[model samples]
Target chain A: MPMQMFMQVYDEIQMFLLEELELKFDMDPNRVRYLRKMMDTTCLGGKYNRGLTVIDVAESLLSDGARRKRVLHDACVCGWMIEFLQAHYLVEDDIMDNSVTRRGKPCWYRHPDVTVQCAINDGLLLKSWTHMMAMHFFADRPFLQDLLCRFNRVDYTTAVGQLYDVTSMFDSNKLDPDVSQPTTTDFAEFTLSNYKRIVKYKTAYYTYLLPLVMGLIVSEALPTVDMGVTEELAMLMGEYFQVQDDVMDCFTPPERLGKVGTDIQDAKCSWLAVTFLAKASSAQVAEFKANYGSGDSEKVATVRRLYEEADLQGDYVAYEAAVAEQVKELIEKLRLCSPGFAASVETLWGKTYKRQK
Target chain B: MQMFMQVYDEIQMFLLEELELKFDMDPNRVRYLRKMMDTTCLGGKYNRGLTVIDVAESLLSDGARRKRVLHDACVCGWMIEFLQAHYLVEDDIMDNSVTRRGKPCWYRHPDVTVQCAINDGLLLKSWTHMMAMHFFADRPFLQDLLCRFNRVDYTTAVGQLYDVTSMFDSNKLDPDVSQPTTTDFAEFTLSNYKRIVKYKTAYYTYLLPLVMGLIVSEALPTVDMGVTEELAMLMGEYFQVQDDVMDCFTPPERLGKVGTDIQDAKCSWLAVTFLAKASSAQVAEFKANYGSGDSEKVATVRRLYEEADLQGDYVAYEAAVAEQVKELIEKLRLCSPGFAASVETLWGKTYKRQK
Candidate 1:
């Protein structure tokens, strides 16, 4: 039923867009089809966890059945908007990562018809689609400015996270071509502290904080919860979620994860890479340095072997248990203040805990 | 003297301080953001942004000008500049452009890859809103202000889509690298040209800033939005046609960079005009010669434009548009006298420019 409402909201938005594409934008039928396909390819086929989380959180926050029914449409629209926002990042991220596949198909940019250039605009358009809907769907609401400010704030924070994440592993000399600086990677800066910062700003806020905060905002329930605890818990969940992503990228099969893992190939500052580097012997470290970010299968396998030798899986299991404990404590604290907030957090954690993909 | 360049420096301090204090961004990252801002945002005439302040100043009462209202107007002005910087950063990548404003394109730096450049562009975009929120939080028109930016940004993005899609056969593989499956000149209509500039260049470049000034001063209710938008669109088309003419006719040194409309198969004003006037054989030959990365093929297209007297066409077009805009300005004067003068200032900056 929740998903049925979500799907209905998506169709309503799509129908509105079809008119704009034809009437306002003067798009030929072919161009219109291209946009439709791009939207479907990028926006759907995710776990739907983020969008559904928005629904669940907002629903729990508004416990009255009548009130929930009254606000359900707006909540669904916000949920789809979050999905669309994630689409924007995915389209751009795929291009940035030089990724081959996403959600079991060619990356949007990798589509023969959609070159890197068009995909760039496609990413921007995905973003525009969200804002356009925000204005259209939420125009009647009084919380429009707060909602927009939240989007912009997260956008700024996430981009900075991307900046840190990109620069963390790449050569800083490339940052300014004219003026040569240090030639090595900022490997020194790639610590657990920086990793959590990167994950929190880059992944956590938009994924965790934004959706939950959005549930609050759309429902006009902002004063009902502790903003501080909400943000802290969201950040911790984001960190834990990203650490799982990093682990699965190394350990999970491509078919299981729906795409080939390229963190090693892309010189990503992943959790496994950081932990492995920290605990390895000098010889092991030298081998990792030489083989990490390699394209050859043997080198990648070597890096993976080093990770196994370092027993990152054991470390991840411990980390996972510890995060669960931490989240349990925070949820109990929330239970004293607001059972609804605690229940929403518990539900999210239940979905987030140990998984293959 | 107009407090234009001074405000640019002030915004730099404000944004950097916010990034450090509010977000706690790294020193290295903050420094990189600063460099990106200076490189992309500066080196322009500041005409579009300055127009915002000029319009706001004209609309404000003498007593009102002394308050932080003027600072808010100036901040909105820089917001326009930030939007420009974002477009340039992304547009250079899209166009595979080399140099901009007599220097390497932001993406052309060896250390900055396509990925880095794209993220930088997104950062610049966010700064626009970040500035708006910080500067206009308490204003009753704050939501209107943010919505204006969002709406204009959406318009600009759509315009970019039109510009990019109008280039060549969309199915072809990187038209500049490989010859597109027969150049599609069907999209090269004068109407499409107008649409492209209105959305892509004009709205954000001219109208948004003028309207933003009014929004901040709470004078938007006083002006006629329809007439103001009409004047802005006229000015946008006028400025872009001049750009199109300058791109083909002006030298790189004069124009500050080379124009690739010919080589990139852009739906340029010159191309559209020539396609309309040229004979059947000339049109057929042009289809072959246009959009080639080869210098010889590009020269053939240029030669065809010359043979058709495209330069003369632009001059005639320019004169007619100039006169047409004067009429629009007069029309605007009846509705909002202060706004008409502001339009004149922008038009004066754009008029008869060789570069």
Candidate 2:
């Protein structure tokens, strides 16, 4: 049924696009195919959780199956809109990060048929797709402004965050961002608190929180879910999720991750790197400082030995345990959403809590 | 006074950018904002935007309201400018164009970051936000104004898709000027090319300015979609044709750069219309040299234009087109003389340049 739901959503979006192309206006067949190809490449063929999570939250809120089926179909479309919006970011990110593979295939920007120029235009189309559909369906809803404004606020925050990530990584001279008197940052600024702020703004809101809140909004369900409490849960969920991702990037074989593990080469302040920095002896610090950011195999091996020698995996397991216990009472407030979904939420946390990829 | 659309529209980007408070001098945000406006927004001819004001000037005949009329016209015109600023950033990035007007594009500027992608999004957002600010904020037609704006933006974005696909695709071209594929002269048709610029340049650049004035004049006058579309179709097509021809013929010192249509593999006016009329052997000559970036090939293509007298081809084309447009103006003159004159202003300005 979840599979059926995503498929239904997929077909609905193409209908809106086709109407825009064929009925509302006319375009070359070549352009129409590119739109369809972009949708399939970015929307389908990946983890459907960002879409399915919205459906799960939406359907769980309704008690009547008859009307439930009708609204849930709309919810399904709203869900895919998130995925579509997310696709715009990924294509841009891949180009920005100079990444090659995504979801085990070539990045959308990497496809031979698509020049990077062609890539960003498709990104704008996805944005237009999201906005116009929200215009069409959600116009009459009381929360329409609320739903659309959330997209802007979140994107702005993410933009500022992305600005920080790229700028901070390069701005390694002076340390304070708050001071306007010529500021800069370096690895020393990559503290636990700093990394968490980066995660919340750059990765969390669009990825975890938008999916959940949008599902509630699309359901015509008054967002009676405790906003402050729910965001708290989403925040920790993101922090937890990213710590696992960062750990996996280093610990797992490159095959499983499908990326080149640039955290080391890029000098990313992964939980392992920061925590290691916190506990190292001066001699160990000197060794790590020398070897941390090189792509050379021996350098990476030296850094890896420092992490394992310091029992950072065991340290992360402990950090995960402490955070999980802190999360329970807040996540319990997710009952302010439907109950089955909270357990589904808990299951996601459980899966990522301490597992290796 | 009429919130002075013209004055504010011209000044709007500075005010909206909050460029006064350390805005003129501060870095690095200051630099980016300044760089964006300089590279993308300022270089345009400003003729399309100026049309809105000219039309609004003709529409408001009252001596008392004349000052206000100019301002409103200006604001509507700036909306088109904002639209231009937004798209040029995206278009330059998409085409990977190194230059615009005579200088570097924003994405191509060494001082500007590649993050001009996100920067373009802010320009788009502020454009609509400013529309609400200048002309329609808290007005009854607020929704109407936004819908018009959104529809045009969506249409233009779609137009860009049509253009990107229809471009002489990069991978399709041979780097060497001498080699030509079956597709070396590619993708422009009178039909599709007409549709592309109508949606792309004409909507926001041409038609939006015209309609923005009408909305200010009356709350909701049932806009004649069919007629306006016809006017836009003809005017927009001719406007782009001038651009293509300018690229081919304009000298670098006359505030122009060498035409990159051949390099970028554009589906230009001559690419379609001329190729359509040329012989099999001539078509082969075009196919060999058409999309080539080399100057010798560019010269070869230029020689063909000289051989065929493309300039004369345009003169006859324009006069025939002028007669059709003159008839259109006569039909619309009864509805509003000023509106009709506004349309005429566009036609005259478009025909102003001659080699």
Candidate 3:
């Protein structure tokens, strides 16, 4: 196994133990312990696939002891940070979306006595702890300040994206019902802009680019690769990844996937669902809008049926694969021109596109 | 008349305008903004009083322009910072507190918006801004680092005090409620502890000593005066000056006295009121507890009657005069020892203790 792969494994184990200890020592030890368990068991259950991919990239680029160790550290820490980020966001989102079960267990917010306020605080504490941990572990490293700047930017951007998502839902003008189906120019334009921007800010930059490129930066490899290119690549990958998830949400089996179909009901501005709304016939579009964003399960089922009729799910799946291929080709082109750094980019592309639901 | 005095006046005016602006910005700004306005207004309202006294002390000490200016800037800024320190505690108290603004607000869990999380952040920003302003106004001033240290220490101490107050209330353990009054030991101890610590942190050190002394230190003819003794004298005066206001809260308003008795519902912690719980009867005690901390007019009336019967109000008034005398005597003693340095101390004491 690659050194990056080993680091990925190490990070998961470390975070699990760290979370367990923190939960054990809290005043409401049981409550925290339960949260910790839910966070780890459900959220942490995601394939260590992203982490492994980051590791592969790091191994190819960093060889010196000091550089390799630092890269290894950053790669692993970034993985944990991803889990930390997701856990905090999901806990709050579950409450906001009124989700009951997540990854097959009761969402943290659904627990008795777990008020929304307390859950929000818990989410904040989670994010704060992530920063505290990063500062603690990386304070002595040479790239600490740079890493801090990157993390702050990433966190703030993600917050901006979330704010945009929430604000869009509450404003009818942003998602008007009178608009044409998926092909309605206004709806398509709005949907694509929000979809791309959300992916860029929330998913792409933070998940793929942040950890992997930060590892390179921390290791002092690719000292001259401007950050802009890294951002562009991550933005593309992020959208592709999210599009895949949107496709799987409606089509993935309940047994195979731990969640109920909730994207539409939660009114998530997922690319597939939004695209369907933009492209479907007037009746199909009406069905999607009426049943999807509302809380009714039967209505949601009807919306999902319409999604099938419109072939939105299949369309997204095919689009995602093609985008991944195109992105891979772009990475190869960049790598061929810059041999020393191409392998890591290729590795990141492969891991992102290959993840199972 | 002095430059420092002029700056002090400007700062106070700026603060008042800021308060008015804040309130007008949003009527529905919640307890956080309301608490901030209250804290800012009440905390630094004494800037003129604190600065005038410190200036007289610095003048008597024959301080130079640099020492005097820095001291005045710091003292004024410290006064603001002190208020900020109080606001942080009060906001947290209101948040954790079960009631505020006539009902259960943030502390009630119903209005528990995550934005309230910014309370501490705001507190930190105030402290940082204070130091930054100090440095900007007087570069290479020796007291810059000391001012930072004091600001940080004051903030952390108040935080601990808040935590202690909350914990005591939670446990229902009355540590100071031993008198025959209706108020419980827990409430009295918590109030007194909070008041004394706040005075020590806010009024005496941050507001009086540091703010005025920073100007004095920078203005002093010689930078070697150490400011230790001068700080002690101002600290003594600050205690007396605040006690005067505290006394008014419990006493009947005399012809010229601007009593904040009504506002004392939100501010001041006089020894009389601090010890009122010990003097109250069981029925009165129940009323005191039911008064919603400062909101219930009925509870305030009941506690006042109980306090008058026990002569606690009169006792507190006497103590206030005696404290003023003690402060004046200290100023006199310093006068003979160091005439120049003594003058600033005397000026501070007389002006602070003046009606």
Candidate 4:
């Protein structure tokens, strides 16, 4: 039923934005048509994991049947908004990474109609649409300010996380074609400490914590919910999820993951990279330095071979088993406060524990 | 005076201080934010930001001119500047612009990548909202204030969409040669041009600051919405047309940055006006020469614009719009002296400028 209602909210919001662009802004018909298509293409392709989690978690927090219907509707709207944020990030990220495909189709920026320039505008437009949709749906709600602030704070945190991610790989020479040599600073940046920091700030908060918080707010349980417990579980799960992602990046096929892996070529401070660095011998380290961050497939394959030689996949299983214990401990702490909330968190952990994509 | 002038430093401290505690961010990362803010948000004309302070000052009674109220206005004023910086940083990338305010654009910094620049712009937007919530937590109008910004942000982006997509086919990527068919001229109409200016330039430039000033001063409830909207749109449209005129006539050294409306094939007032009066052959000449990145083609477009005497038309248009604004201010005077005085304060500064 929430799925049906979620679809309803998407249509309503899309129509509202279209009418605003058409009747209120008097945007050109062609421009209006483009935006309508742009919104559909960019916003709808995601797996909706982050989105459905909002309703699932919110339903777990509330029991008043009289208020449940209205609460679920609002939760659905918030879920869709999280999807908007996801789409916005992916659009911008694809441009940054020079990615070719997203969700099995061409990246929005790769579309001949959308160059890097217009894609930037489209990304900003998506962000504004998120806020505008919030304004429309939560117009007279007392919790509007709280919702907006939460959205802003989480987004800011994620941006900072992205900053850490990019700056860790900051090699201006890498961007310049004339420069043949890649910088060693990226290797210096690959540390377990830095890796965890990036994972917590970037992946954990938005993916795990935001949906839970949105659910709590709509259910009016935020005031009583223990945020510390919520964040601890979220961060733990987020790191675990990202570690699985890094492993999947190498082992999973493009068909399974919906895109090719580029952590090697990107010189990402990936979990495998960090673990291998912590354990590699001098010769292995030198080999990695030569092959890592190179665009040549041979170089990429060499690094992939290095990852296998180091047995990162086996270590990843060990890491996953360890994180399962941490997740169990955190959920126990959460369960003391609210068993239903803890159940939802545990369910989410199960969904993510061995995610292939 | 101290509060208004030192608002940037205040925001910087807050970024490293309170915001640091809230996000638990690394101090070095906080420092990166400060540097990004300084590089992008500073060095602007402060015309839009200052309009808030000046208008709020006019509306505030002597008894109401407390330090807190003044600082509140300054905070809101600087938020507008931050908003401008956000748009400009992203706009520069969109235009593939090289320079802004007589220096390399923020995205052109050697240390800043295109990705970092985009993320930094989003940070600027996020800060605008976060700062409002932090500064106005106790104010009843905080929600209204946030929504005002959200609404204006949406409007401005729509305006930008019109401005950019009008130069090229919606289905085309290249801007230089996209407008092949003469039928594309339908977007170059006077009505479309005005809509672009009104949505893109006018609301954020004039209406937002004035309304924000009123909100800060607690004077919005007393003022007429229709009147302020009309006044902001008029002033905004008039100011943007002047900018378009300056883009062609004013030298880069005087204007602080080179104007690329001709080269960029913007839906500028001059192009819109010229197209309206151009003959069939002239239209061909204009279309061929317009939107090219080459200097010769740009020069050809400029020559055609010169032959149309757009500068003369701008002079006449400027005078007429000024007279019309003066009459509106007089009309506003009968409704509320404070509002009328604030409108004049904005008009007086905006009436005539070489740059």
Candidate 5:
């Protein structure tokens, strides 16, 4: 059912762009053609379950079907807003990582025919367009400004997360290897904290928590709230998700994940990288560091071999079980808010958690 | 004042780098940001922004007020330069042109990777941050500046999109034939060309300089923005039309490239003027080879310009605009001799450019 709802999210954005932007707003046909194309491929190409969470939780919370239908409609628009913002992230992220493909297609900027400079503008256009959508759909809603402000905050947070991400890769530690140093009781200089910091800001707020909060707001179930529980909950899920991605990057197939894994090559502070640095012997750490982030497949293979030799995946599996259980506990707490809201939103995230891909 | 802009380039870098710190953001990953700003934002001629300072200084005589206006002018000037650079990097990519002001395109630059797209976003994010910090930080009418910039930003993007539809490639796709296909000449694109100009270039280029003056002078409460926008917008169209003419008619080495306006089927003044006065056969002549990129074919299109008296019309067009503006000066005597001299200087700069 959630998968079906997710597909409808794509249809909503298409109709909205076709009629609202191109016809009513009289946007240029040629540009709108590209715009609609991007909307279909980049925006709608995602699994869209996160955005569907906005609609799903709103549905469960509303009492009556008429208001339910209306709320659901507005929720769908907000759903697309989430998807659009995510598209912007994905597009820019691909450029940053020098990624060739996303979601099994060439990254939008990689086309090389048209200048991708406009692709950057398209991302910001999506930013402003999201603002326009908020006004268009929810002008009379009491929480419209609040929702818009939250979106703005999330954007800033995500960008800062990105800011850290680039910095971490380029951090002054380049070319340094403390490989021969004796093992210590503690990890080096708060590297673990920094990894979590990057994930929380960069991934957690925008991905997991944003849709959930946007949902409750649309349903009017949560008002004037701190969102304290969801912050902790979302951050937990965000960490799990990133860890899963890191694992998948090395473990998952290129076909299952759409794009080839570029985490190590991009100097990304992936979960596997962090844990490997944390647990490996100094000689192993130095050796891993030497081989890590090389684009060469042989070097990448040696690093992965080292991780396997150390049974790091064993560590990952055990830690994953703990985080998954904790996330399940938080998902169950949604039942305290209202009927089956936990059941509705929690299951959407379940499909994503245990994927080999 | 020319050398003064150089120092603030440092400040601009500081403010931008300082932004990450304010968020308590890790300075590790995006440490390249400050250096990137220096590359993209500075090293422009910056005439568009400096004009704001020139106009503002003329309007203010009080020592304190003039200093404040001058300061804001510099900031606004930087914004203009930033906006142009921002648009140009995108424009060069969008238009597929190679050179701008005699440098390789940003995307094609050796130091730049495919990451120019991300850098472009940083430039805009910084553009908004600069505007917010400089004038809107603790001022009245913060929203005024923001909304106007927002309105202009949206308008230009949409206008540019419209323009891309209306124009063509290096003969691959021409705006006049395959796409918009409407030319009773002036009845079609040549007419709406004014709107495309006002939206895309005028608001940011011509009007921005003037509006930046009013904004700095705190003259918003007293004067008429509608009238100011109209006068500035007229000049914006006039300036663009002149640019279009220069694109086709100017010598190759003079502008560092050969003429291809005809070959591009651009909504240019030379085409617009010809279509207005062309005979039916002349219209067919155009239809056959307008974007054909034939040197001989393009020469005929140039000959059409002469027959239409466009060169002479350009001369007459400027004098007419100058005359009406002179009449505006006579009635308002607005802001005195300094302002008058700046206005005339502006016209003189554009009136008869050989290039």
Candidate 6:
């Protein structure tokens, strides 16, 4: 998976994290060491796929070492920032939703003796730090101001979406029960829409477009392509990736997946099972709803049975397969700036969607 | 009191408040509004005196219509910004605080309604708008970057202070606390340090000095005087004027001198009666602690008893006499300035310190 790209990405991310740690802790050796540990262990574990994909693409297009290095740096920094963004949201979400684990580790809020209040501020500081780093690194670049503004807008939009999600739970009146209800069909459509919006506004821009297009920006290659075409493609891939993750959470076994029950326990609006439940008959819907949140293992089993009976599990598997075919077709049709970059993207996408868990 | 000066001061504050009201619907508005309002009012009231005092001092040396207007405007604008500094601290204090304006506001939780959050942003906007209006109207002579930097520094300092304050709260190690039981006192002292730092950094440089020295900056008059000399005089007078207002909040009943127990209920650290009682013994401390919250009745009764015990009622009378003596001394010392301007300042000082 482009080992050279992965190494370059890690080095850039490490530099930014080190700089931010120093600035935040103000030369306090102990605090800086602790932050470095947290940043490396907690923030750096993700598959460097998002970042490596951009670098691989850039390497294919731009042969100039200086331009390639610049693109690689920006792409890696954006990837690091994306992970920081996730940490920000997850920290707050864990406190709000009372979750215990993230990425196979104790969620930040679950850390002993840490006030939940600090988590919110820390989240804010993380986002602020992202911009500060961007300003520090890219201040002399022509597109610095525009890029900063874009980053701010993207973050604000995601915050608004999260705000809506949190508000909906507390105020049922905000929810369109007619459009989004317990029925299999309604639940499926509503959940799909919610998941799509979340991925489009949050994950798509941050995880994919931001790194890729920002890398293009750094490479001065953005003007060569149809503007924002890359962003559209990235969004499609991002949404599909998130849906696949949700499906795996519900259907994959413990041995295959490191985490389970996130959708049901966290009350997430996943696409697959929601569609199945909404389309099911009255008895099936009743069984699904009752078993889902009752905290009874027998009821949970009954809910899984209902899901299987509704063919929701089969439907999800089929949908994932269809999306995989679509991604392959899109890749074949895409004209690359460099063939190696195109090949890297194709390889990354295949690995991402083919995860057993 | 100089009726025109008093009227000018009131109108300026009113304009600021009106701008604040425009953006008050957001969720964060209350905290922001409270911050700007407290900072502007306190700072504005203190720094505005420097203008009148500066004009009074230089009246005999040289006086021109344009110079007087320029000085007055600069002083007013500086005061406005100084008030902004105060508001920033108060807003952050409230944000970090559990309650504000009798309710739990921002910084309490992550998922507060957007309307409240909008309010907080609005307060910041309102402060900026006020400064811009004052700058455009008053100090057309100063460089635009100066004005911009002033506003920027106001926000930066406030943000830094908030970071410090939040860190203190989060670590459960009050950075300024001398002892655990003295938390309120420590908070008050920290608030004062911020107040002094903000005034010195913002008001002294960006506000009072600029306001009083603008005539010189513009080459209108008083260009021979050292900037430090001018700043020191203005600072002393401005501090004295603020002390007078603080003294008045605990004064006995007099026509137009009605005490501000409601304002005290807002948790102003300026009310010395409460400050004195805050240092009292355990039993008295318990009684005072009961009044630390936002309850109106508790605040009023607490202030009343505090006033009685600290002899604030008597102190107000003595303070008024001292204020009159100070004004008389200011009038006699008039050298470069004419007696009319000095008389104007004396009149304003007497009115401000009244009751």
**Top-lDDT structure, candidate number:** 1
Runs of candidate 6 with Cα error greater than 4 angstroms are A1-42, A64-68, A167-191, A227-229, A248-262, A290-311, A336-341, B1-355
Shares of reference contacts reproduced by the candidates, in order, are: 0.45, 0.16, 0.00, 0.45, 0.11, 0.00
**Of the candidates numbered 2 and 5, which has the greater TM-score value?**
2
The best candidate in terms of DockQ: 1
User: Mind giving the per-residue lDDT tens digits that candidate 2 earns over B24-104?
Assistant: 222454444444544555655677677777766666546656765665567666677777777877887766666667776
Global lDDT of model 2: 0.67
Interface RMSD of each candidate, angstroms, one decimal: 4.3, 8.0, 13.9, 5.7, 8.4, 11.0
Tens digits of per-residue lDDT for model 2, A227-289: 777778877888787788778777877667765566776667677888898987888878888
Model 1 pairs whose backbones collide: A174-B111
Query: What are the RMSD figures for all models against the true structure?
Result: 2.7, 5.7, 11.6, 3.2, 8.1, 11.3
lDDT of 5 at B184: 39
Model 6 chain A: ten consecutive residues of lowest lDDT: A176-185
Each model's TM-score for chain A is: 0.96, 0.86, 0.81, 0.94, 0.87, 0.80
- Pairs of residues clashing in candidate 4: none
Model 5 segments more than 4 A misplaced = A1-30, A57-70, A110-121, A139-142, A173-194, A219-224, A280-312, A325-352, A355-357, B1-22, B27-117, B126-148, B159-200, B206-234, B238-355
For B280-346, candidate 3 gives per-residue lDDT tens digits of 4643544444334355654565455455543455456446645654554445445333433443443
TM-score of each: 0.94, 0.81, 0.55, 0.94, 0.68, 0.57
lDDT of 4 by residue, B1-355 (tens): 4556688787778766864776556665666677788878887678778888877777776554556667888889888988989999898888777777887777777757777788888888878877787788888889888889789988898888777776665554332223342345666878777888998899998999998988888888877788778888999999899888888878877887777787777888999999888778888999887877899998888888888888888889888898889888887888778888888888877888765
Q: Where does candidate 1 chain B have its weakest 10-residue lDDT segment? A: B173-182
Candidate 1 per-residue lDDT over residues A68-92, each given as its tens digit: 7757777888888889988998888
Top-scoring candidate (TM-score): 1
Cα lDDT of model 4 overall? 0.81
Q: Predicted chain A of model 5: TM-score relative to the true chain A?
A: 0.87
Candidate 4, position B86, lDDT? 91
User: Which is the winner by lDDT between candidate 5 and candidate 6?
Assistant: 5
DockQ of each model against the real complex?
Answer: 0.45, 0.19, 0.05, 0.42, 0.13, 0.06
